[PDB]
Design a protein around this ligand. Structure first.
Ligand SMILES: [Mg+2]
Ligand SMILES: [Mg+2]
Ligand SMILES: [Mg+2]
Ligand SMILES: [Mg+2]
Ligand SMILES: [Mg+2]
Ligand SMILES: [Mg+2]
Ligand SMILES: [Mg+2]
Ligand SMILES: [Mg+2]
Ligand SMILES: [Mg+2]
Ligand SMILES: [Mg+2]
Ligand SMILES: [Mg+2]
Ligand SMILES: [Mg+2]
Ligand SMILES: [Mg+2]
Length: 150
RNA sequence: UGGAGAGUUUGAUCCUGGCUCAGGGUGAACGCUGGCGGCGUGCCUAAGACAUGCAAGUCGUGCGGGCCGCGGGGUU
């Protein structure tokens, strides 16, 4: 059903009289490679607990990606903080031309041919968030049609 | 029919921002190594200095000769 991908895991530290106190951050992608993708970022005392928490959170955050012959209905450029993502539609045979973060998402989203580009802050966390916002914003001829029918 | 990023400022974080790496190219050079062939290519520096040979001539159907030679004439 849903395939999970781990974007990254960081160790993060905090301070107390005595020393440092770690936590673990986990960014996890989940999708059915059939138009549904979810992002999840969970943290916990230990990695596993974190990951699991991430996965659990991903499923809580789903996006309905309007796949088309394997690509996206058009181009969007989304800015999440200092990270900017650029998604450009492509023909078949192209493949998923993207950095690891946007890829993992696009792939589990069902996207198969797409032109991508990371601009601004390359921060994986905000890039991944930038992506979901991009996809989430994709519209369709029918969608526009609906909106401008009035 | 066309576009991937990564490492590094912090105890940790986000940002800014420089440095650095992965790719492609070259009339190359250097090191270790070196079997065959085809096609290309080879002073990028002193437009510095050059031994030696060759690199622009040809025409007797424009012309008159010199030199070396043969043949035939005008005479007893
Ligand atoms: Mg770090
Ligand atoms: Mg900005
Ligand atoms: Mg990435
Ligand atoms: Mg930058
Ligand atoms: Mg500082
Ligand atoms: Mg440090
Ligand atoms: Mg501080
Ligand atoms: Mg940088
Ligand atoms: Mg040769
Ligand atoms: Mg030659
Ligand atoms: Mg020269
Ligand atoms: Mg010379
Ligand atoms: Mg000269």
């Amino acid at each position: 059903d849903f395939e999970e991908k781990m974007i990254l895991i960081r160790r993060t530290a905090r301070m107390q009289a005595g020393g440092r106190r770690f936590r673990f951050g986990a960014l996890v992608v989940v999708g059915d490679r059939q138009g549904r993708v979810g992002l999840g970022f969970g943290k916990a005392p230990e990695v596993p607990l974190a990951v699991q928490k991430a996965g659990y959170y991903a499923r809580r955050n789903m996006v309905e990606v309007p796949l088309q012959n394997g690509t996206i209905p058009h181009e969007i450029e989304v800015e999440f903080g200092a990270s900017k993502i650029v998604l450009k539609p492509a023909a078949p045979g192209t493949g998923v031309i993207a950095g690891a973060v946007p890829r993992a998402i696009l792939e589990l989203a069902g996207v198969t041919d797409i032109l991508t580009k990371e601009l601004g802050s390359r921060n994986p966390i905000n890039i991944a968030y930038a992506t979901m916002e991009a996809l989430r914003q994709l519209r369709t001829k029918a969608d526009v049609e609906r909106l401008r029918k009035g």
